[PDB]
Amino acid sequence: SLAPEDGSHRPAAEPTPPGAQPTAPGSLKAPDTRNEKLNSLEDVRKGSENYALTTNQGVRIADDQNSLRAGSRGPTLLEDFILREKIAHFDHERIPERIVHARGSAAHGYFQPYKSLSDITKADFLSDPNKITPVFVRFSTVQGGAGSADTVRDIRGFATKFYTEEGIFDLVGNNTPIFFIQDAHKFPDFVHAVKPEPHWAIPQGQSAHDTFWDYVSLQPETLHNVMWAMSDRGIPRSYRTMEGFGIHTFRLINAEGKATFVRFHWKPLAGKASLVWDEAQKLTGRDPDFHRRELWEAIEAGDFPEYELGFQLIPEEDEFKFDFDLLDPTKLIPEELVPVQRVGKMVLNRNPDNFFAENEQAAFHPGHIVPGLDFTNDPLLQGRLYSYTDTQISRLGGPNFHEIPINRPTCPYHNFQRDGMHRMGIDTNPANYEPNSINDNWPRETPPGPKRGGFESYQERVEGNKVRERSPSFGEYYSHPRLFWLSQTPFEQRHIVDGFSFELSKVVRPYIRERVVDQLAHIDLTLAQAVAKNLGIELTDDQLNITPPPDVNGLKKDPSLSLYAIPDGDVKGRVVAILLNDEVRSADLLAILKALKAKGVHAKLLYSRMGEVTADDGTVLPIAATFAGAPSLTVDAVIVPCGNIADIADNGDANYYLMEAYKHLKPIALAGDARKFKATIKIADQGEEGIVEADSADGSFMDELLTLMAAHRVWSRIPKIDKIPA
Amino acid sequence: SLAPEDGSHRPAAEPTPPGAQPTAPGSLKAPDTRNEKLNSLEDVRKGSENYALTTNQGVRIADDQNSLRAGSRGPTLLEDFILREKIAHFDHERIPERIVHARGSAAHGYFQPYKSLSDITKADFLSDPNKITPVFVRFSTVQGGAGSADTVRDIRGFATKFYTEEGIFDLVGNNTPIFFIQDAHKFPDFVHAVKPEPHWAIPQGQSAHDTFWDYVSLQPETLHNVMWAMSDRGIPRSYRTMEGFGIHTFRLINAEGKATFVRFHWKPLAGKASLVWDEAQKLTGRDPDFHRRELWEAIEAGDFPEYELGFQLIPEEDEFKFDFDLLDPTKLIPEELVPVQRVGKMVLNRNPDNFFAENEQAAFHPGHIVPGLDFTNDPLLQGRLYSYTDTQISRLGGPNFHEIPINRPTCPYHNFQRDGMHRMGIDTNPANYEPNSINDNWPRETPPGPKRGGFESYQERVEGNKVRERSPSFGEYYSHPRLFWLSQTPFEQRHIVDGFSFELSKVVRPYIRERVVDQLAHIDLTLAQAVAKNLGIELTDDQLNITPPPDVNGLKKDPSLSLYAIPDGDVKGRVVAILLNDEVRSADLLAILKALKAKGVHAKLLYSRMGEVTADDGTVLPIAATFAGAPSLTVDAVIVPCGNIADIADNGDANYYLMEAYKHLKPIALAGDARKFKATIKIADQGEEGIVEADSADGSFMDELLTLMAAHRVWSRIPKIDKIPA
Ligand code: HEM
Ligand code: HEM
């Protein structure tokens, strides 16, 4: 026995707040959390306690510390079959990462609709409010490798596998409502442009390099999703606090055969929230696993990620009623024109057991639809349908990837396909072809119908010649970027200007910067001028005279495009740092922890060393991390309770911790003699909105802090932060 | 006509300093730098200019912007074989990364010995000072993925493929002289323990987590290489400023058949230099590609990485004359006991053309030796011999990986091996077996001999029973950790204590931290007390009374084990940030820039925006980056010239630039009114060692700065920095 006698090696199998217990595989942390898919994986879960160590052939091993050798200082012998199996398996551990979205984090959960949608769709998972569909969801960045950092500036993926009773449906979306390009033929060009450059394989996780901006300057259709990327949408706080979108128009098909166009939305019930760029960039260094960690720890705490599925629905007869093409995936459908109808709720409530087996090997593909859905001719969706099956057979080693446990349907699947590498299913059917008489033609085709029917495509009319040509209706590139720009708050605009300015400053060939600023002048002259000033570029008179693009169907703005213009804050699952001293005022700590607990906000107790400190009343406080070990970047607000403030008053790291949190617009709360830290961040005696201060930490102090936290950041401080050296 | 008319898109094909021109493929940047391997790759180099765009079957493409569809808003057709080939290739771009050392950066170069070594080895590449051997070198970290960050705390790999006239020799070493474990059977255990933990796949690029320190606390053989990783050896400034080691004792065999034991070394001719931890961790966020970038741009500037190969040589009769076993890879051979004899010089002077083709697909394996070398029974080396071929056939898709152009020998290769995936060579031999008469038995075996002979193993005597048993001679774990600790300067010892303290602070189970501190108490009580103090742990009286381990062969230190105890600084290829203002004193800038140029030190001119500023006298100064764009993390020293200081005096980024550089112990030089920045970093009016200050940048100001730069960092400043909020 190498475990400690006290049992402290094993985390409690109950919900616990971040940092309170070591994290664990999902089935051991939350063994009572079940759904049909989770249960179905029991055939392949493998335990360990009380079992002997063996080879993969079942032979017990006596000595797992040594190779077999001729004498104990002799050569290793070829007959050591136990060493060679162990080292061969290790030698073959890695598989290819995904070509894009290689970096991602996943969890299990469940979905149910609010009401039956049978009037618009015959899909079975949308038919009954009390029929629950398991899901597995992977969130991702796009450009970086599987070992890249989480809080980069990038688009994020949001892929949901729904294990329905009529097949797997994969809704493979991103966190912005449009993509960069119009036709899948260009996907390798765009991805190669954004990815590390091919001579030296730099930069990882960043679009701030010449080839990406070269492509953008030469392909104005990219500008819309570039605007989203350069805004704070490119730097979410958490995968719990971003939107999701399917991007393409799809179809819903009901039992009477009617097609309705649909775009898919996920609304985060925790609200929309993003980092600021200096925080995000520094956090890729202090904790490159911040989003993976925060997601796993939110589910271990019971702060399950919840999202509302929503549909924008457009009747068939209204296909051409907008000033943009519904099938153009560089155009969004403004919610002021077509509202999102609430459809159902998805809750992620258990982490996987083994990241490689369940997350790395999962395969999501947007051609996996079910009866009641269909595609459209969007030319980027069309080409996606070829790529996901093709790449998943390369990455997962052959055509039986649907038999890898995470990807298996929970509903029946039977057909005449056979063989392939690592075939697990042993078919007993005498026939491997149809039509057959020798098995009375089973398994059999099923006619389409209202429920449980075979799939039939909606009989869309196709009229045209065989052409490689872009629809002229797709040839407008600046109106949607402008609508997005005008819908942002002033601080969000400033952050967009700063994102383009920072990125193009890293473009070494100056003419590319100039060409991008010329594109920006076709969107908005105020944006283009503000970027140009930061680049040392002066717009020409012709640039100053470019006519702005038209409004989008009369809209001058749509506030649903902003992260912050409409309040939607939720503090449950956020975290505060509490900076301890060696004689903390216990009464402050009581009041602080009670008010945080009432709102579901977690706390991390920090100090200048690890171990414990004792409060004024004898209470022994364990320290979660040092001020340098868990920087302000990792929390949403900072509280300094009273005590022996002289202990930490001259500590550089405690002072910096407040300066960094202040620069990054976080609420700060100072009780009693902790108000002496007002001098590090230059707060006048009268106080400042976003700094909470009082003689002690009481009801009123904590309510004011929590109100600031519900607004996420203190935007009004922005003019005060350029002078702080942090 | 998408290129600019001024031709500024294309970098000059001449050596240029970092940042001055976009980087490019080696054969375009330095077409006239040649060696036999680089010439032999011409058969597969593919150009582009003036050629038509084609499918891989040579069919010209007319429209690479669109898929083929029935109507320009219609569905994509299956007959579009141009789209399908392009998206199929994209879908299968990735291959598995290396199981370990997945993150690496490589270059081409050449090796020449200083004199013939025919007395001690018949290896042909060491036989003649005029014999030049091409090399390809890959430097790497160990734990993180290919998309992880460069300036992590980790061991570094240093692998050299020598393309000799008698076969490929791969010298596959690391940047510390020992490894963590003694027997290859344990390598999957140790690697699994340091790699991201299996439930959640965190943390990337870090050993600061519970499973690593759990394994270390239960396997004290790891403590010697852990000491090296916790020292600043774990965070090199550049691959140019670290040492290399083969680790194992190997053999040299001369023409008379005499075996000499050898351990291999590489000495960096640029000196040894490392970062400090807060700088390295931050730099993983601000530039995760910093080491890859620095190596590439050193080569493009002519600052070619140079290393001296050196041998520690032990006669066969002296195998048992040390307190440690020569075959134990957790033990070093102190240079005070066995000096390194200089053997030759390697210069890396050309970057690859295509990172994937040449770096990602390169395969190095320490079983690739040539006649004149041999192995020993080191039980870690013996198990490596199985792993490398096994893993490379999985990673590179089959057993013909030696036909991938970068891995091909430059000498002849002919045998009776056939077929396999991806077979390039078309064999015309009538026979595919020997002995044969049908091809007169060619190709033929060759007897061993002094030159151009066949390989024969040295006939070492083996005697013992078949056992899975560790040699008792390997059962000593604390003397070499202690020798290392006692050989470090006081500031190096502080940084070791801070490394263990930071890492064990991130171990969530406190009993593991206690167990590690108990192991430190077996190495050195001062080390163990200082780490325990930072963890809030008190040593027991039993721990206070553990007797230290013995000295190693009478040594109580060996200064060659320190980075800094013996000055070896070289400033060429280093870089200085120059913080501009909008009216710089041009005389200061003339003096600063030409002084740096004379010593081969590069400069980056920084400001608060991109573009230009104008000096007092009209000189137009182009700006390389903003203060936030190119943080002090990325430079070795900071110079602030006189001029209009009020322009930048209240710029929080300019101030913080100097605070970060000051905290990280970098030299800082302030001319004229730039001395007003003394107050930002709290420098006495009377000044302090490490801050250069004068009325102007003339006289001795640049010599004083350059002297500071040759000592790397200002260690005496360490007690001054805990107080600084930065
Ligand atoms: C609306 C535009 C797109 C969206 C929203 C989208 C979204 C995503 C997401 C979220 C993933 C990762 C799924 C996971 O977590 O495993 C992914 C993977 C992938 N995507 Fe797409 N993507 C789009 C366009 C395309 C296009 C145009 C192509 C190629 C024609 C493509 C090819 C791929 C490939 C090859 C993978 C890797 C899939 C795997 O290995 O399993 N994507 N995409
Ligand atoms: C002295 C101890 C060792 C040193 C110095 C060492 C050094 C290295 C280096 C430098 C690389 C990267 C080569 C490159 O740049 O591609 C590498 C890769 C590798 N090492 Fe070792 N290694 C050690 C021990 C081991 C052991 C004990 C095993 C297994 C028994 C092992 C298995 C591997 C594997 C599987 C790879 C990836 C090779 C590839 O995919 O091409 N290593 N090692």
Swiss-Prot record, chains A, B:
InterPro entries: Catalase (IPR018028), Catalase_AS (IPR024708), Catalase_clade2 (IPR024712), Catalase_clade2_helical (IPR043156), Catalase_core (IPR011614), Catalase_haem_BS (IPR002226), Catalase_immune_responsive (IPR010582), Catalase_large_C (IPR041399). CDD domains: catalase_clade_2, GATase1_catalase. It comes from Escherichia coli (strain K12). Keywords: Cytoplasm, Heme, Hydrogen peroxide, Iron, Metal-binding, Oxidoreductase, Peroxidase. Pfam families: Catalase, Catalase-rel, Catalase_C. Belongs to the catalase family. HPII subfamily. Its cofactor is heme. It catalyses: 2 H2O2 = O2 + 2 H2O. The gene is katE. One of its GO terms (cellular component) is cytosol. Its EC number is 1.11.1.6. Decomposes hydrogen peroxide into water and oxygen; serves to protect cells from the toxic effects of hydrogen peroxide. GO terms for molecular function: catalase activity; heme binding; identical protein binding; iron ion binding. Its main location: cytoplasm. The keyword Cytoplasm applies. GO terms for biological process: DNA damage response; hydrogen peroxide catabolic process; hyperosmotic response; response to oxidative stress. Homotetramer. The active site is at H101, N174. This is Catalase HPII. It is an enzyme of class 1 (oxidoreductase). There is a cross-link at H365-Y388 (3'-histidyl-3-tyrosine (His-Tyr)).
